[PDB]
Design a protein around this motif. Structure first.
Motif, short mmCIF file in Angstrom:
data_model
loop_
_atom_site.label_atom_id
_atom_site.label_comp_id
_atom_site.label_asym_id
_atom_site.label_seq_id
_atom_site.Cartn_x
_atom_site.Cartn_y
_atom_site.Cartn_z
N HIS B 190 0.83 -1.20 0.00
CA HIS B 190 0.00 0.00 0.00
C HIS B 190 0.87 1.25 0.00
N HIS B 191 1.84 1.28 0.90
CA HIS B 191 2.67 2.46 1.05
C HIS B 191 3.53 2.71 -0.19
N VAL B 192 4.24 1.70 -0.70
CA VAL B 192 5.06 2.03 -1.87
C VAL B 192 4.19 2.33 -3.07
N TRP B 194 1.19 3.83 -3.14
CA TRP B 194 0.72 5.21 -3.05
C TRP B 194 1.78 6.16 -3.60
N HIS B 195 3.03 5.98 -3.18
CA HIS B 195 4.09 6.87 -3.64
C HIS B 195 4.42 6.65 -5.11
N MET B 196 4.24 5.43 -5.63
CA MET B 196 4.38 5.23 -7.07
C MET B 196 3.28 5.94 -7.84
N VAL B 220 -3.06 10.48 3.42
CA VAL B 220 -2.70 9.06 3.47
C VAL B 220 -1.78 8.80 4.65
N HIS B 221 -0.91 9.76 4.98
CA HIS B 221 0.01 9.58 6.10
C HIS B 221 -0.67 9.87 7.43
N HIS B 222 -1.60 10.82 7.46
CA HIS B 222 -2.43 10.98 8.64
C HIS B 222 -3.16 9.68 8.98
#
Ligand SMILES: [Cu+2]
Ligand SMILES: [Cu+2]
Ligand SMILES: [O]
Ligand SMILES: [O]
Lengths: 325, 325
Positions: B190-192, B194-196, B220-222
């Motif tokens: 999920h995290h990588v 989102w940044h992609m 997304v980080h909140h």
């Protein structure tokens, strides 16, 4: 900060937040169920030694601003045709401690249907003997002129016995009085009693005294001139002078006589300004003195020759003695 | 040729056994004989991006194969984005496939995998392709060292096996109670991803604008932070503290994880102060940057390069803050 702040979102509230920051240092994370500190009430804040460390810190912020202006010149300071020929005091400057009582009855629980009893606290408080300033001026204009008399007490030496320059004294000086008086043509001595200082107010009348006077008026019908008491804002009269030492201390008594017509423009000179306008203003009126607060000591004085060359400014050495019990 | 089946198979083959030269004869042949500059009509920029990358390749300026890669390393990121830029300019799939095959065999595998993923995601040519999970393409980045060691032993002994992953640390480490959150392989995908999808290096000249990206970055980080704190609450732990540049980082970390090439991931001791990082920043630089961001927030505007103000007291303000933070 106050609600007059143009930008509280950016500048915040340094001084008020600092009161709480200091006040809460005994329980900063709320773990201990401790109530607010003495710094979190104006009734109590000066009891804490840190009050004065905080307020010197704040005072130095203001001082960076006031120091940024050009020093006053001769022409800035001169009240043309007004010279202070002499400054003296009628009466020795003597401090002492005496005793003062106030009632604790409101602190204790009573009722229902059980009688009260007199319960008082007795405190020792600084006080001083009455004195009167003798300020000899010469008005060499062919007309009477309104003048502002500004009276400050300044240290001569610091705690290390080092003689202070005027620039190093000025920010340490304490305001003793400010008053407006018409100076007739010629040479005249102005007398001003310590009791009339616009910096100070008397001790408050007791709650018991206020009840007695109000009850005596209501039960009967008598117009008592309550327009007697000062206000409650103002340095207590008893604390006008520093304690000083039993062996005596010498101070500089600084007098600046300034143009009252210009100083009071927009507020009249003959008008009544109350008993505490120097720091507490005039209830329901504009502030009566147009000059910067602290005038003429609020800017840098790098060259003492400038002040010495102004005939309407003069300082003299006075001695204050503490009389211990 | 550009059907979904063929494009998917091509991507599967390119990502298969990523640390070794390709085992597919057709990809081998392309990597040997294709010339990224042979026909620049295949590119929407007439070959500009391919020229940039080929010059770096031919001058031996690219990161070697079998070497760690970090998207936060400026030069390594620039090299990966050089390949993304080529793929992004391809008009048709055979350009995309052939450049991918050619540069797979020339470029660092970490750079290549990154570029191919964002190339698929951000090119219309990638529509319909399903990218394999990164935890099967580069398992070292999602698997602890103990399990990787068991996999190496299985391979050395030519025996199949399935190995159970446990968490890092011990039961004495209360932080291990919530390891199932941040170590979950899907949460990491999920995290990588989102940044992609929303990369900080995105420039709209690549083809399209990423709507509200800076506000989505905040959100997304909140949500990651709030979700982690919910797991802490679920496990009898207090919420995380916030970091500060002038205060200790209380909770250290032993990853017990390793790169395929580059060694074990480093440990951080408990209760360490931030130190300046050579070639990255001083701790003080971080504090200044933080101060400047808070100045914009508390001013209500961001300052442009020429000094003019950009209002953030409006709904897009949070997005603009995401952009600058
Ligand atoms: Cu205060
Ligand atoms: Cu992130
Ligand atoms: O205060
Ligand atoms: O205050």
């Amino acid at each position: 900060s106050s609600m007059y702040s143009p930008n509280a979102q950016y500048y915040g509230s340094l001084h008020n937040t600092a009161h709480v920051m200091l006040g809460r240092q005994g329980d900063p994370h709320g773990k201990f169920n401790l109530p607010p500190g003495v710094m979190e009430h104006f009734e109590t804040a000066t009891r804490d030694p840190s009050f004065f460390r905080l307020h010197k810190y704040m005072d130095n912020i203001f001082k960076k601003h006031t120091d940024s202006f050009p020093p006053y010149t001769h022409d800035d300071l001169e009240f043309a045709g007004m010279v202070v020929d002499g400054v003296a005091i009628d009466g020795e400057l003597t401090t002492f401690f005496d005793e003062f009582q106030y009632s604790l009855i409101n602190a204790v629980d009573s009722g229902e249907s059980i009688e009260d009893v007199e319960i008082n606290a007795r405190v020792h408080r600084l006080n001083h003997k009455e004195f009167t300033y003798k300020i000899t001026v010469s008005n060499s204009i062919g007309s009477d002129h309104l003048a502002t008399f500004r009276i400050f007490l300044c240290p001569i030496e610091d705690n290390n016995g080092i003689t202070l320059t005027l620039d190093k004294e000025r920010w340490l000086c304490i305001e003793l009085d400010k008053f407006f008086q018409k100076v007739p043509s010629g040479t005249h001595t102005i007398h001003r009693s310590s009791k009339d200082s616009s910096v100070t107010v008397p001790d408050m009348p007791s709650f018991h005294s206020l009840k007695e006077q109000a009850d005596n008026a209501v039960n009967g019908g008598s117009d008592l001139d309550l327009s007697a008491y000062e206000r409650s804002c103002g340095i207590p009269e008893r604390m006008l002078l520093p304690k000083s030492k039993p062996e005596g201390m010498e101070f500089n008594l600084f007098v600046a006589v300034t143009d009252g017509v210009k100083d009071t423009e927009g507020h009249n000179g003959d008008h009544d300004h109350g008993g505490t306008h120097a720091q507490c203003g005039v209830h329901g009126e504009a502030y009566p003195d147009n000059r910067p607060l602290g005038y003429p000591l609020e800017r840098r004085i790098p060259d003492e020759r400038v002040f010495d060359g102004v005939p309407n400014i003069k300082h003299v050495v006075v001695k204050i003695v503490h009389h211990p019990e | 040729a550009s059907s979904t089946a063929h494009k998917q198979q091509d991507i599967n083959h390119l990502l298969d056994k990523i640390y070794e030269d390709t085992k597919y004869p057709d990809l081998q042949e392309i990597a040997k004989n294709f010339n990224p500059l042979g026909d620049t009509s295949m590119y929407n920029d007439q070959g500009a991006a391919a020229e940039v990358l080929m010059k770096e390749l031919n001058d031996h300026r690219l990161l070697e194969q079998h070497h760690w890669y970090s998207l936060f390393n400026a030069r390594q990121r620039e090299e990966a984005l050089m390949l993304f830029a080529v793929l992004n300019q391809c008009k048709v799939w055979h350009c995309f496939r052939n450049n991918a095959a050619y540069f797979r065999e020339q470029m660092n595998e970490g750079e290549f995998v990154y570029a191919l993923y964002v190339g698929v995601i951000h090119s219309k040519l990638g529509d319909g392709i399903v990218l394999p999970p990164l935890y099967e393409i580069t398992p070292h980045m999602f698997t602890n060292s103990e399990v990787i060691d068991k996999a190496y032993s299985a391979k050395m002994t030519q025996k199949a096996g399935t190995f159970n992953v446990s968490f890092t640390g011990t039961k004495k480490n209360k932080e291990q109670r919530v390891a199932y959150f941040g170590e979950d392989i899907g949460m990491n995908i999920h995290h990588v991803t989102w940044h992609m999808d929303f990369p900080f290096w995105w420039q709209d000249s690549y083809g399209n604008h990423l709507d509200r990206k800076g506000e989505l970055f905040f959100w997304v980080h909140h949500q990651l932070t709030a979700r982690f704190d919910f797991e802490r609450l679920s496990n009898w732990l207090d919420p995380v503290d916030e970091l500060h540049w002038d205060r200790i980082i209380r909770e250290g970390f032993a990853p017990l994880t390793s790169y395929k090439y580059g060694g074990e991931f480093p440990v951080r001791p408990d209760n360490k102060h931030f130190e300046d990082v050579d070639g990255v920043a001083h701790v003080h630089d971080m504090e200044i940057t933080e101060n400047r961001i808070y100045e914009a927030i508390d001013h209500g505007y961001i300052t442009a390069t020429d000094g003019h103000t950009i209002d953030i007291r409006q709904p897009k303000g949070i997005e603009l803050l995401g952009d600058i933070i």
